[PDB]
Structures are given as C-alpha cells and as structure tokens.
Design a protein around this ligand. Structure first.
Ligand SMILES: Nc1nc2c(ncn2[C@@H]2O[C@@H]3COP(=O)(O)O[C@H]4[C@@H](O)[C@H](n5cnc6c(N)ncnc65)O[C@@H]4COP(=O)(O)O[C@H]3[C@H]2O)c(=O)[nH]1
Ligand SMILES: Nc1nc2c(ncn2[C@@H]2O[C@@H]3COP(=O)(O)O[C@H]4[C@@H](O)[C@H](n5cnc6c(N)ncnc65)O[C@@H]4COP(=O)(O)O[C@H]3[C@H]2O)c(=O)[nH]1
Ligand SMILES: [Ca+2]
Ligand SMILES: [Ca+2]
Ligand SMILES: [Ca+2]
Ligand SMILES: [Ca+2]
Lengths: 237, 237
C-alpha cells in the first residue's frame, strides 16, 4: 502492499437508440479528485501489478456500492502483463464478493506501450473472452490502437478515438474514415462506440451514421465516486 | 562529419494495371550488404541529421548513376529532429546536380514520433508537397502509423503494411480490412500501394480487389547498389 491511494470516477456510456445507459467507464482519480494522469504518474514498474489489481477491485467495489446494474468498463493496464491467469482470480474474487456478473464487466485494451511488438494482447483478449468478460479496443484511430489490432483479433466493441470524432459533422475526411470504418466494424460483427462526443452536432451525425453507443462530455462528464445522470437535452430532445 | 559509411539497395514498385515499373524504394545497406537495421543501429542523436542527409543524397546519386528513369522513393526517418524547412536544400541540390527531377522523388512518412505536437509531420508533409515532392504514408495499418494520420493530412500514396497483406487471399478479416480501406483511400483520392507481396496468391487477390501499385519479394527482392528487374511470371500471365 500500500504505497498510495486513489479512487474512481465514473462516466456513462449511453445507447442513443434506446436512450438508456449501457454502462459506465471507471476512471481513476486522486482522493481529492486529482487527475487520472497525476495518479498514474505515480505508478512505476515495481508496483504495476499492485496498482492494476487495486484499480480493478476499487472500480468493482465502488460500482457495486453505488448500485450499478448495467456494464462496468475497466481499462486494462497496457503493460503486457504475463501469465494472464495470474491475478485474474483477484478480479474474479472481487466480482463475487460484490455479486457483480463477469458478463457485466468489459475490459478496454488501450494498446500504447513501449514496444510495438506485443500482439500477444491477443492471448489476453481471447482468455478474458473465454471467462465471459466483454472486451473492447480503446482509442482506435490513435496511438498504437489501430487496424493492426483488428487484423489479428476482434473484440465485442471498438471505442473510436475522440480525435476521429471531433467536429465530424463538417470534416469530410473524418466522415469518410468513419463511414468506411463502421462498415468494417459491421463486417467484423463488432459494435462501435464513439468516445469524446462534446456537442450535439457530433452526436447527431454519429447517430445518423449508425453509431448507437456513445460517451462524452456532451452526455455527462465523469462523476467523482458517483454515477452521473445523462444530459436532459438528449434524454428528452 | 562521416563517422562511418553506408550505401543503398533499391526495390522496384510495380503498377500491375499498366504492367510497368512505378519506381524504386531506396533501402540503406552496409558497405558489405549489411542490414538496414545494422546501419541505423549506429545512428544516435549526435549523427541523426547527418545520417539523414547522407541517406537522401546517397540514394539520389546512386539512382542517377544506375540510370533510374522512374520514381525514387525515400524514407523520411522519424525523429528527423523535426525542424525541416531550411535543411531541405541538400536534397534539392543533390537532385539538381544529378539532374533528378524533384517531382520523381517520393518521401515515405513512417510515423509521428513527436506526439506532444499534433500537426508536426503534417507540417513537413505539406511543406514537401509544396515543393513538388511526392509523398506517401508508409506502414499503414501497423505500428503507430494509421488512421490518425489520414484524418489530418493526405499524401499521394498510402503504402499498406505487409502485416495487413500477408496471406490475405486466405484471411477473411484481412480481406475486409483491405476492402474497406481501399474504398476509404478511393474517397480521399489516395492511391494505394500493397507492400511486402510475397506470393502470387496474395498478388492475384490484391489485384482483383483493385490495387495497382505493389512491392515485395514476389516481384523482386532489393538489389544491392542495383536496379532489379521484375519477375517475368507476373508479366507473362
Ligand atoms: N476533450 C474531451 N475529453 C473527454 C470526453 N469524454 C471523456 N473524456 C475524457 O477522455 C478520457 C478517456 O479515458 P481513456 O481510457 O481513453 O484514458 C485514460 C486511460 O488510458 C488511462 N487509464 C489507464 N488505466 C486506468 C485505470 N485503471 N483507471 C482509470 N483510468 C485509466 O488514464 C487515462 C486518462 O483518462 P481521463 O480520466 O483523464 O479522461 C477520460 C475522459 O474524462 C469529451 O467529450 N471531450
Ligand atoms: N518479409 C518481407 N520483407 C520485405 C518484402 N519486401 C520488402 N521487404 C523489406 O520491408 C522493408 C520495407 O522497408 P520499410 O520502410 O517498411 O522499413 C525500413 C525503413 O523503416 C528503414 N529504412 C530502411 N532504409 C532506410 C533509408 N534509406 N532511409 C531511412 N530509413 C530506412 O529500415 C527498415 C528496414 O529496411 P529493410 O531493407 O530491412 O526491409 C524493407 C524491405 O527490404 C517481402 O515481400 N517480405
Ligand atoms: Ca478507456
Ligand atoms: Ca479512449
Ligand atoms: Ca518505406
Ligand atoms: Ca513499409
């Protein structure tokens, strides 16, 4: 073990077709709502497995304490940790003590590590899918999270990076990128999710294009140790 | 300022529609055909801009000595100190002295390894296009080189990474990625180039799906200080 402490904020993912909440992403904060980066910047190589586990337990315990009945999304620590089976029971144990279905837990793989050689996140994704977890590719269209991931394995969901979503209602290039990626997603039976939606104009274009799942300040900012309600402008039109 | 010396190999790019050679990529080799990895291993921060400039001039001089009449494709090294604006003169002087038309020189931009700045390699790409150079995004669909690049700037050509190409006649996920990227490249009016083609089966599929420009061992391996001829089996049907 116990070097430093932190907690979670939660940000809803909204199904714009049914206007209900698909789930919440768990986002780490310091005890006074300090930033995620200011917490993760204290995570080094020696306490990576401890911090990984504590994030998982902390997100599961808080979501359950707050009464989350939809999905809980947890970023998988990008550091390609090994023996994917080692300390997966620490996540299985936590979900059992809070009676939280494995099937309601989605791990988001945000590949952005030091070495561009680690395709064996495929081993981890296929293992986690075998236990019943949902899976997502995070930050698709940025960093390392690219087509190279889709080529070798497919997750339930792909979170399109907010760089690709910003101002898309009037950016012809991003429009074409998204149009052709959605058909790719459809061909791969993968569900899209647009992240970082900030304005109604982006929302309205994404929804016409066929995206149902969306996340962003437009719907709700992350809520410190709380499960935010979603913007009235969208939930009543 | 020459701590060591090297030279070049050249590998043809074939336009399979017109059945003629589009150009040659210049690939650095050791003086005894040592690997490009072995030559770039000796590049540190101190001799970065020096090595770079030597690469471009060496490639132009050799190409001109060997009698190249088509395009010459040069890799723009990532971490190319990211401040070119004035230091393109050495490339412009070399092209003029060896009477090599600048419009037949293509630069291949493999990555944006200055991610603290956003428009960084966009700044360079637009500058070299403004001079009349050809440009290409290299290793598309692998590594850090992907859709995030296409969203903010467009080159004349996008070379699709051979990881996405490998065994594509057999791999239905890769067939879908490529079908939908090809239509995206069409929408953006970017000419696709398939890299690393190794067999006929791959070539025939890529050809049938509308790729014209291709490169790889199936056509010819890189030629040490030479301009290799292209395999007769593809040009004899
Ligand atoms: N400009 C903008 N930003 C938005 C919007 N909606 C959400 N954001 C923010 O984007 C980030 C998405 O999280 P990420 O997973 O892509 O990066 C995350 C994630 O990669 C990483 N992280 C890694 N492991 C984590 C972990 N166990 N728990 C929480 N965060 C973790 O911390 C990074 C910091 O994210 P954050 O909390 O500051 O901001 C959120 C979120 O508040 C939006 O609409 N507009
Ligand atoms: N397995 C396989 N490899 C192939 C095939 N066809 C070509 N290759 C090779 O793939 C590499 C494509 O070059 P790249 O730009 O994608 O990576 C290049 C490039 O990023 C960099 N580099 C090489 N020459 C450079 C140069 N002159 N200037 C700046 N950077 C250079 O080093 C890497 C290795 O060059 P290489 O000679 O060993 O291999 C070539 C090439 O010889 C193929 O069909 N199968
Ligand atoms: Ca995430
Ligand atoms: Ca993300
Ligand atoms: Ca290249
Ligand atoms: Ca390449």
């Amino acid at each position: 073990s116990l070097d430093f402490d932190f907690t979670m904020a939660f940000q809803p993912i909204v199904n714009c077709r049914t206007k209900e909440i698909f789930g919440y992403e768990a986002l780490v904060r310091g005890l006074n709502n300090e930033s995620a980066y200011s917490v993760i910047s204290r995570v080094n190589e020696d306490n990576r497995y401890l911090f990984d586990q504590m994030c998982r337990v902390k997100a599961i315990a808080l979501a359950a304490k707050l009464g989350l009945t939809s999905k809980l999304s947890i970023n998988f620590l990008p550091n390609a940790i090994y023996v994917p089976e080692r300390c997966i029971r620490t996540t299985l144990e936590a979900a059992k003590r809070y009676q939280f279905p494995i099937e309601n837990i989605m791990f988001e793989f945000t590949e952005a590590e030091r070495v561009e050689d680690v395709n064996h996140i495929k081993r981890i994704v296929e293992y986690y899918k075998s236990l019943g977890f949902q899976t997502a590719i995070d930050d698709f269209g940025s960093g390392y999270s690219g087509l190279n991931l889709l080529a070798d394995f497919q997750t339930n969901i792909v979170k399109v990076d907010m760089g690709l979503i910003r101002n898309i209602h009037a950016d012809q290039v991003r429009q074409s990128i998204m149009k052709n990626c959605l058909k790719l997603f459809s061909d791969l039976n993968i569900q899209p999710l647009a992240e970082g939606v900030e304005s109604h104009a982006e929302f309205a274009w994404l929804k016409a294009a066929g995206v149902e799942l969306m996340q962003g300040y437009y719907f709700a900012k992350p809520g410190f140790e709380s499960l935010p309600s979603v913007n009235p402008e969208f939930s009543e039109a």
